[PDB]
Amino acid sequence: GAVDEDDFIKAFTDVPSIQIYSSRELEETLNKIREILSDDKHDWDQRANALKKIRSLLVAGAAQYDCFFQHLRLLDGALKLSAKDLRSQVVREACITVAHLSTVLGNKFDHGAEAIVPTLFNLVPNSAKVMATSGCAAIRFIIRHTHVPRLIPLITSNCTSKSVPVRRRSFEFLDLLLQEWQTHSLERHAAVLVETIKKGIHDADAEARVEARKTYMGLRNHFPGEAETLYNSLEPSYQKSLQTYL
């Protein structure tokens, strides 16, 4: 987990060094990158290189050009297609690039995050560990750097997935979100948050329960009154499972 995020961070900059010579030149470069990624029939390694190139551009200061953000949205279709590849290494590069974009751009990647997150969630239950872990890491990087309130319903929704692994990962994501986001970014989803956490605390799966309990700490932090009300309604054994670390 922590190891996955560290490998991601290292992969962010472990790409070819490059320089941008003009706004127009940057656009030419981005257009070519989009062409390469838009056709899933193009040699997979060449598509991987195109994904790394985006990171090379980030390292080179592309975020300082207004045209970059224009092209960012133009690339959403290409990024989604890349993250949907059947080849684990392509999916990995795509997730790393998505994570890097979020890390560098922060809230300026709001549109990109919304556009890509559902695709990343589809990777979570994937049997190939390379794809699953890459998707999970990319989501965690987004949660920490691009706070889009619309991402909450997606997370809480997946906390109720029939897929157990998906539930475990989703409560983990919610736990992170509450530790990261400002209360004002959460206000509009207080109800769904309380409800999702209440259900999670009683999850049939032990691991999912461990995560729902961590998330409860976050609920107390941002919505103390609601957290207390939730606690006072539970059975003794479950109230005890929520005891503060001592």
Side-chain angles (χ1 to χ4, degrees), residues 66-222:
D66 297 309
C67 67
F68 182 59
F69 296 104
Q70 169 68 75
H71 285 264
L72 227 59
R73 296 208 65 183
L74 287 173
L75 286 169
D76 287 326
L79 294 175
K80 186 176 179 180
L81 183 67
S82 303
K84 288 169 58 62
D85 205 86
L86 296 182
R87 305 173 185 69
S88 292
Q89 289 304 300
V90 168
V91 176
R92 182 165 189 272
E93 284 309 323
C95 291
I96 295 175
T97 296
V98 160
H100 193 193
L101 285 168
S102 174
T103 296
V104 174
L105 313 172
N107 291 313
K108 289 182 182 179
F109 190 57
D110 66 324
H111 283 293
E114 288 186 57
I116 198 67
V117 169
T119 295
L120 299 175
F121 261 97
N122 287 325
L123 299 174
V124 179
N126 202 105
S127 69
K129 171 195 277 291
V130 172
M131 283 184 199
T133 57
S134 294
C136 288
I139 295 176
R140 290 182 60 86
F141 272 98
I142 286 167
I143 288 172
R144 162 168 249 118
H145 308 276
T146 307
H147 304 10
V148 181
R150 269 189 282 286
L151 301 177
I152 299 178
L154 265 55
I155 301 179
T156 55
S157 184
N158 279 100
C159 284
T160 308
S161 176
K162 299 180 180 298
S163 169
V164 175
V166 173
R167 279 190 248 127
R168 301 168 177 169
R169 249 59 291 171
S170 298
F171 274 108
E172 178 193 301
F173 297 154
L174 185 53
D175 180 36
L176 174 65
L177 189 148
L178 301 184
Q179 290 167 167
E180 295 298 303
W181 293 28
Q182 294 286 80
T183 303
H184 71 70
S185 296
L186 306 170
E187 299 180 0
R188 284 171 52 66
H189 302 78
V192 71
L193 285 177
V194 177
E195 168 185 291
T196 306
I197 292 170
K198 182 160 74 67
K199 300 180 185 177
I201 295 170
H202 304 79
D203 203 277
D205 183 67
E207 298 167 61
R209 273 196 281 93
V210 170
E211 296 305 303
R213 284 203 293 280
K214 292 175 180 169
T215 303
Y216 175 68
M217 288 176 216
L219 190 65
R220 290 193 306 220
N221 181 266
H222 299 283

Side-chain angles (χ1 to χ4, degrees), residues 22-40:
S22 60
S23 179
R24 278 243 297 173
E25 193 269 323
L26 181 58
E27 290 195 85
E28 296 173 0
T29 300
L30 287 168
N31 281 322
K32 226 292 79 63
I33 285 171
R34 180 155 51 71
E35 283 182 52
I36 301 169
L37 300 174
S38 298
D39 194 324
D40 60 0

